[model samples]
Target: VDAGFENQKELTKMQLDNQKEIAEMQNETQKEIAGIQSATSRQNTKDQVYAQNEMLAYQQKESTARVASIMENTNLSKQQQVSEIMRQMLTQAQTAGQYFTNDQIKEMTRKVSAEVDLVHQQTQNQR
Candidate 1:
């Protein structure tokens, strides 16, 4: 009976030792999982910030292109109007030379010059 009790006690000690080792391993695994989670959170924040900056840059480029297109259209319209007015002046000078005196031609030239100056001033103001 004494020998049997001694063997039972030895077996219980071995089982307790194994349980203690398993507990220590579980604690270590938990710590490693926490570390990985922290690292992933930081990387996610960086990616979000980078994406926002890229979107803002794209919007700025789109707005700049739109403004340039509008300005080009305005200039084209101004050029067409100027061309038509010059054509009218040329026709008048050719056909009405005999009816109008040199003084009248000079006065008409001054008026057209003033009108062009006013248009330029208006364009500058728009800019």
Candidate 2:
């Protein structure tokens, strides 16, 4: 009976050693899996940041182009307004020149009208 008891104790020790080895192997496997997951997360973060930067750059360029286009249009409108004012002034000058002969008034009207027409033609050509 004593011999049988000793045999049982040895068998129990062998089982405990095998279980400890298995536990260690399982822990190592878990650490490797954790490392792989961390690497994937870092790569994903990098990609997200790159995509965000690209979008911001594109938006900035588009905004700059739009502002430039608006400025150009405003400048063109200002020039057109100045030209119209000059045409009106020339017409008024011809009318106020009452001391001039009728032929002189006619000539002045023709010249002013031709100038105004040229300005209008140029504006239309831009379209």
Candidate 3:
């Protein structure tokens, strides 16, 4: 009976050690999860900044050139010019999906529309 009591004591100690190991494993898992979440957040931030820069550069080049081309077209009436510009704006914004977020795309569309309308008004005043 004394030997049996000693065996029971050894088993209890083993169970306590196992519980400690389990707790340590759970701690490491939580740390891994936290690191992954931090990395994902950093990646998202980088993407947002990259999208903004690309959109700005595209506007400075593509939008300007497109608007200049349409403005110089002698055959099209002023109303036709506006319609063509709007179509171009739509196409460009849609194709901009490669680097832009939906919010960025909407912002680009609004800015382009506003610029074209302003130009349209200026030409209206000229005649």
Candidate 4:
């Protein structure tokens, strides 16, 4: 392994994982925005669609920031960091009295858990 490889790989892999999550989040958010746009297609006003677009944009910004912080943390495993980040987002919404929908939480948790398991298996297989 290269000198400084451990830290570099840790940081690099974590960042890759974060970017993956960020892209996924943005894509999903866009889908939501598109759905909102379609729902408002025949509306007399664009207010709802505009509000949803703004909110999704705001949330995406928040997600980018949140993942950056967690990615910089070298002590946590990727899965642990993801779980912590997930909990923080859900908790923030809960703190705001606007918790994430159950399906949102469940789907995110399932994805992260499954991805981590796959990564773990891949590591094992490479040995």
Give TM-scores for every candidate, taking all chains together and pairing residue i with residue i. Answer: 0.36, 0.39, 0.38, 0.30
**Tens digit of lDDT per residue, candidate 2, span 2-75?**
99989999999999999999999999999999999999999999987998888999999999999999999999
* Cα lDDT of model 1 by residue, 20-123, tens digit: 99999999999999999999999998888998898999999999999999999999999999999999999888777756777788899999999999999999
- Candidate 4 clashes between residue pairs 3 or more apart in a chain or in different chains: none
lDDT assessment of candidate 3: 0.90
Predicted candidate 4 versus true structure: per-residue lDDT over 4-31, tens digit per residue: 9888999999999999999999999999
Q: Scored by Cα lDDT, where does model 4 land?
A: 0.86
lDDT of 2: 0.94
Model 1, 62: alpha-carbon shift in Å?
18
> Where does candidate 4 stray beyond 4 Å?
1-3, 42-127
lDDT of 3 by residue, 9-73 (tens): 99999999999999999999999999999999999999889978888987899988988888877
Q: Rate the local accuracy (lDDT) of all candidates.
A: 0.94, 0.94, 0.90, 0.86
Off by over 4 Å in 3: 52-127
Candidate with better TM-score, 2 vs 3: 2
Q: What's the count of clashing pairs in each model shown?
A: 0, 0, 0, 0
TM-score of 1: 0.36
Sliding window of 10 residues with minimal summed lDDT for model 4: 95-104
For TM-score, the strongest prediction is: 2
Which candidate, 1 or 4, would have the higher TM-score against the true structure? 1
Lowest lDDT 10-residue stretch of candidate 1: 94-103
